[PDB]
Amino acid sequence: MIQEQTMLNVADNSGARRVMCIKVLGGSHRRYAGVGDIIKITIKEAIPRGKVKKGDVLKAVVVRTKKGVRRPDGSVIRFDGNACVLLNNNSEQPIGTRIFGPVTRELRSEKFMKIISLAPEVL
Amino acid sequence: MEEKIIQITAGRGPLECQWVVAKVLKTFLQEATQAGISYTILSREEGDANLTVKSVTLQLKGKELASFLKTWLGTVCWVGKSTFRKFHQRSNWYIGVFELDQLQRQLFSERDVQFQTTRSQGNGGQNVNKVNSAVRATHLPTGISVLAQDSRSQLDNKKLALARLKEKLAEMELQQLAEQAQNHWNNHTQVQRGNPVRTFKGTDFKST
């Protein structure tokens, strides 16, 4: 459950701390983006010396949500906040070099194996 | 067939520099006609005394121009005593030759004009709330738009909008010549007094 105007935290060290979602990609009249979905973001406030600066328009991937993710056995894993990892607008690869917090295996694919490897713990 | 526009200027120099400019212009024209290229005179603003020209602009039309020009472009020096002051000591007088730039002046196409019909924003009456005689001629490359609503006949409104677009683009075509003459002007103070490519000594005016 991530819409436009939704405010997310940042789960890597690209330099940004808060981002705001401005588009859900991949369909017409799309409402929500879950874990593993790409979104378009803008940076709202960042550290003074980082790889990204405030006000830039860029891509991201959703990693952690409060809504949760269902599993085949019917279980559900929730978190206490919304987090995302910043990706390059053209190549869609992570900008930073370190991942904070746990992740899930909904990211286990050929596109986010780097994120999976860098994550300190995987649920 | 190449087109070159060159300027010969005295810089910020005295009547001796103006006289040198006149002589060098004459020799340049003679050498160009010998080399077989044609020309026309554009500006020949006069100096302050007799037979003293301040600056001149030349239009060059011919073939193999970049080889004829490269022995002239730069600084030309005349070595001789001043004829206006019989006891002055300065002996080297420098004048400058530069290569200028021209634009891509094109006649106005009408196929670039887009028309929009909308409602004239008055106060207003119930007939003007209907009328779509407001004609907007928008020029798609430049983005410049002008609106005409003077007459209630939409043909005349369209004609007036087209005429106003003509006029207003004829003020964007006119602020470019001034903008490039602001660039022609700098060449006057850009003359460097040294490293001469050509030297003329005495009144015999021998090349070197």
Partner: protein, 123 residues
């Protein structure tokens, strides 16, 4: 001038500054040959004088003077500056060393070669 006055406020020493401040405690301050030109001296001299513009490592900018006869320097290059002031070239406080991170020696000089960086012409 009295002793009571001199004990209530002692003699003040004169502070003196340097005329080569961009050297910053160092006989040389590294810089890039941004742009190279010639200027004309003011009264009562007349010639062409060869100089070069240089960008300091701390974010400032200086101008240097090229001695000798014949210089082969261009832009996009890095040189040094030794010191020595030319007056009638208003604004020039440094001399280029003949061979300082870009430069060469004076071509076919034969005496006083140490100052103009000419290698030894050996029979």
């Amino acid at each position: 001038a009295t002793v009571n006055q001199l004990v209530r406020k002692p003699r003040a020493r004169k502070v003196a500054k340097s005329n080569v401040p961009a050297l910053e405690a160092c006989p040389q301050k590294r810089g890039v040959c941004t742009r190279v030109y010639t200027t004309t001296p003011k009264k009562p001299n007349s010639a062409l004088r060869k100089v070069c513009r240089v960008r300091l490592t701390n974010g400032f900018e200086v101008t240097s003077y090229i001695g000798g006869e014949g210089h082969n320097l261009q832009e996009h290059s890095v040189i040094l500056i030794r010191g020595g002031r030319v007056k009638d070239l208003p604004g020039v406080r440094y001399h280029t060393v003949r061979g300082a991170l870009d430069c060469s020696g004076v071509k076919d000089r034969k005496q006083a070669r140490s100052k103009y960086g000419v290698k030894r012409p050996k029979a």
